[PDB]
C-alpha cells in the first residue's frame, strides 16, 4: 500500500528525494499565450503559467487570457479549474470564467495578505450592503451570507449576469489556516474541509468545474486536488490498494504545472489520503471525529 | 538565538517557506564559460554550473574549465572549493585542480552509485596494487591506506606530479551514509565527521582549499560547509548569538549556486550548528558523545 510506501519513505526520510523524482518526471508543455507581452499584467507570478493545451479561455472577444487551467481527470471522473489569486485587474475575468464555466463552488486555499505580502485580490464582497460590479465583464457579485469557523468560512455569494439579469448562487469555501508553502493543521482539519466542500454538492458532475485557487493556483491547490482525486479513485475502485498517488500527481501535472510545491505537501497528501480511506473504506465515526479534531470552534 | 528561531520555525512548520525566501533571495551571476558548447562534456548536470567570477581555472593551456567553485569566506577566514562528482573524462582535471590549488583534504559526501544511478566516477584507487595515472594531466594517484568506519572512511592517498616527480599526501574523507537530497543520520554523525576532517589538519590555512564535493557539489556540500563556517564564526566571535545562518548561507550562495538543496537540509544545518556550539561554547564531553552516538562501529 501507499501506507506501506509512506511508512517506507518516512523511515528513509526520502520525501525530498521522491519529490524531485516527481519534479524531474513532470510534463512540460508550451505556455506561449501566457507569455505574450500583452498578457503580462494578467499574471501574478512570472514563473507560474497555464499550459496552452489546458488553459481556460474567456469567451471575451477582446483578449481571452486568464492564468487558469482545466485539470480534467479521466478515471476519477472529476475536473477542477486551478487558477492564481486574481489581480486587481483580473477579478472581472475570474468571475467571467466562473460564469462561463458554470462553476458552483470556489475553493480559496489562501488568505489575501500572507506574511506581509499580498497574495490575492479582495475579489468578493465582505459585507452584504456592498456588492461589487465588475464593469469590464458585466457581472454583479453580492454577499448573501457567511459561516465563519475556526480555520475556514463558507459564503453564499450571488453572481448576476448584468447582461441577462440571470443570477446564480456561488458557494465559496475559504480555508484561512494553510500557509504559503505550508501544510494544513492536520489530516483532520483538511479532510473536514474537503468533505464540507463535497457535501455542498459543489464538486458535483451536474455543474461546471469547481474553481480551486491559492496564490499561484499550484501548491495548496495541487494538494487539495491530489487528495480528493485519490479518494475518488479509491472509491471508484473501492479497492484503495491500487492507488498510486505519485502517478495521480503526474497525471495532474499534465494539465497544470507544479501541482504540489513542497516535499512536505507531498508527505501531507499521503497522510490525508491514507486517513480518508478509513471513511471511504467504511468507517463512519471518522468523519465526526475529524470535525472534533478540526476544532472548528 | 538561532535556537530560538529554529524552535520558532519548527513550531510554525516554516522550513519550506523560509527556504524559498532564501532561494528567492540568492544571487545570480553569469556562468558563461560553463555553457560554452565545448565545455558541455565537462559538466555532470545541465542545471548546475559555476559562476564565472568564482570558478576555479585549471592552469591547463588547452581548456581551463572544471565545474568547481571557490567559496572564499571573509569573516570565517575559511575557503572551500565545491565541485561536482568528477566524470570519467574529468578525474584528470579534478586531480589537476587538487594539485594546483594545493588542497590537502577531499571531502566526498556522496557514493559513486546511488539508488541505481551513477553520481560520480571512481576517481581514486580502491586497492594499493593499482594506482591510477591520469594521462592527460600527468599525475599518478595511489592508495596508501584506509580507515573504514560504519558510515565514513578516511584514506591517505599519494598524488604525484609525474612531471616533477614531486609527491603529496591527500587525506580523503568519504561520507557514505548521506543520501542524495537527504540528511546525515543525526547531528552526532555529522558533527563527528566534520571534526574528524577538522583534526586531520585538512581545513587548515596553511594549505590550499579543502575540495568538498557530492554529486553536484551543492546540496550535501552546501550543508557540510554551512555548518562548518557557522561554527567558525561563533568561535571567531565566541559570542555564538550573533550568527545568522540564513545570512551565512546567502553569503555562500554568492560563490556557487544552490548551496543547500532542500528545506530539511536547511533545518538540519540548524540542528547541527546548534549542537556544535555546545562544544565550541565549551562542553568537552559532547565530542566524545558524538562519537558514541555516531556508532562508528
Amino acid at each position: 500500500e501507499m501506507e506501506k510506501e509512506f511508512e517506507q519513505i518516512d523511515k528513509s526520510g526520502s520525501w525530498a528525494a521522491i519529490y524531485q523524482d516527481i519534479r524531474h518526471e513532470a510534463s512540460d508543455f508550451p505556455c506561449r499565450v501566457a507569455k505574450l507581452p500583452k498578457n503580462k499584467n494578467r499574471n501574478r507570478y512570472r514563473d507560474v503559467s497555464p499550459f496552452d493545451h489546458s488553459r481556460i479561455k474567456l469567451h471575451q472577444e477582446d483578449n481571452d487570457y486568464i492564468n487558469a487551467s482545466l485539470i480534467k481527470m479521466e478515471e476519477a471522473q472529476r475536473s477542477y479549474i486551478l487558477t492564481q489569486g486574481p489581480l486587481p485587474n483580473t477579478c472581472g475575468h475570474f468571475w467571467e470564467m466562473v460564469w462561463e464555466q458554470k462553476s458552483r463552488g470556489v475553493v480559496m486555499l489562501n488568505r489575501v495578505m500572507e506574511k506581509g505580502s499580498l497574495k490575492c485580490a479582495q475579489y468578493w464582497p465582505q459585507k452584504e450592503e456592498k456588492e461589487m460590479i465588475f464593469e469590464d465583464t458585466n457581472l454583479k457579485l453580492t454577499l448573501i451570507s457567511e459561516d465563519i469557523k475556526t480555520y475556514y468560512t463558507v459564503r453564499q455569494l450571488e453572481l448576476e449576469n448584468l447582461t441577462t439579469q440571470e443570477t446564480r448562487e456561488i458557494l465559496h469555501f475559504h480555508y484561512t489556516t494553510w500557509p504559503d508553502f505550508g501544510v494544513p493543521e492536520s489530516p483532520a482539519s483538511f479532510l473536514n474541509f474537503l468533505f464540507k466542500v463535497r457535501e455542498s454538492g459543489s464538486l458535483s458532475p451536474e455543474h461546471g468545474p469547481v474553481v480551486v485557487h491559492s496564490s499561484a493556483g499550484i501548491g495548496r491547490s495541487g494538494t487539495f486536488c491530489l487528495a480528493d482525486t485519490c479518494l475518488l479513485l479509491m472509491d471508484k475502485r473501492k479497492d484503495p490498494s491500487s492507488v498510486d498517488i505519485k502517478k495521480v500527481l503526474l497525471e495532474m501535472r499534465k494539465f497544470r504545472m507544479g501541482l504540489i510545491q513542497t516535499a512536505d505537501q507531498l508527505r501531507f497528501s499521503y497522510l490525508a489520503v491514507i486517513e480518508g480511506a478509513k471513511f471511504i473504506m467504511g468507517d463512519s465515526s471518522v468523519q465526526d471525529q475529524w470535525k472534533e479534531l478540526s476544532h472548528e470552534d | 538565538e538561532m535556537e530560538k528561531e529554529f524552535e520558532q520555525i519548527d513550531k510554525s512548520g516554516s522550513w519550506a517557506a523560509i527556504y524559498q525566501d532564501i532561494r528567492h533571495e540568492a544571487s545570480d551571476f553569469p556562468c558563461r564559460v560553463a555553457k560554452l558548447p565545448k565545455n558541455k562534456n565537462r559538466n555532470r548536470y545541465r542545471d548546475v554550473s559555476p559562476f564565472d567570477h568564482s570558478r576555479i581555472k585549471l592552469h591547463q593551456e588547452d581548456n581551463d574549465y572544471i565545474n568547481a567553485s571557490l567559496i572564499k569566506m571573509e569573516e570565517a577566514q575559511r575557503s572551500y572549493i565545491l565541485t561536482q562528482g568528477p566524470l570519467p573524462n574529468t578525474c584528470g582535471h579534478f586531480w589537476e585542480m587538487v594539485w594546483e590549488q594545493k588542497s590537502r583534504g577531499v571531502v566526498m559526501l556522496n557514493r559513486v552509485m546511488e539508488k541505481g544511478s551513477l553520481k560520480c566516477a571512481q576517481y581514486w584507487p580502491q586497492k594499493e596494487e593499482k594506482e591510477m595515472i591520469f594521462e592527460d594531466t600527468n599525475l599518478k594517484l595511489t592508495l596508501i591506506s584506509e580507515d573504514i568506519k560504519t558510515y565514513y572512511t578516511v584514506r591517505q592517498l599519494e598524488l604525484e606530479n609525474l612531471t616533477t616527480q614531486e609527491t603529496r599526501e591527500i587525506l580523503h574523507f568519504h561520507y557514505t551514509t548521506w543520501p542524495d537530497f537527504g540528511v546525515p543520520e543525526s547531528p552526532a554523525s555529522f558533527l563527528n565527521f566534520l571534526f574528524k576532517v577538522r583534526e586531520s589538519g585538512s581545513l587548515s590555512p596553511e594549505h590550499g582549499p579543502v575540495v568538498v564535493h557530492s554529486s553536484a557539489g551543492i546540496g550535501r556540500s552546501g550543508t557540510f560547509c554551512l555548518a562548518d563556517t557557522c561554527l567558525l564564526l561563533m568561535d571567531k566571535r565566541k559570542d555564538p548569538s550573533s550568527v545568522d545562518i540564513k545570512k551565512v548561507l546567502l553569503e555562500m550562495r554568492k560563490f556557487r549556486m544552490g548551496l543547500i538543496q532542500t528545506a530539511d537540509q536547511l533545518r538540519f544545518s540548524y540542528l547541527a550548528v546548534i549542537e556544535g556550539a555546545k562544544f565550541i561554547m565549551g562542553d568537552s564531553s559532547v565530542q566524545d558523545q558524538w562519537k558514541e552516538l555516531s556508532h562508528e562501529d
Binding site: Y45, R46, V48, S215, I218, Q261 | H24, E25
Partner: peptide
C-alpha cells in the same frame, strides 16, 4: 525580484 513564487 518580487514577481516569483517557485
Amino acid at each position: 525580484d518580487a514577481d516569483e513564487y517557485l
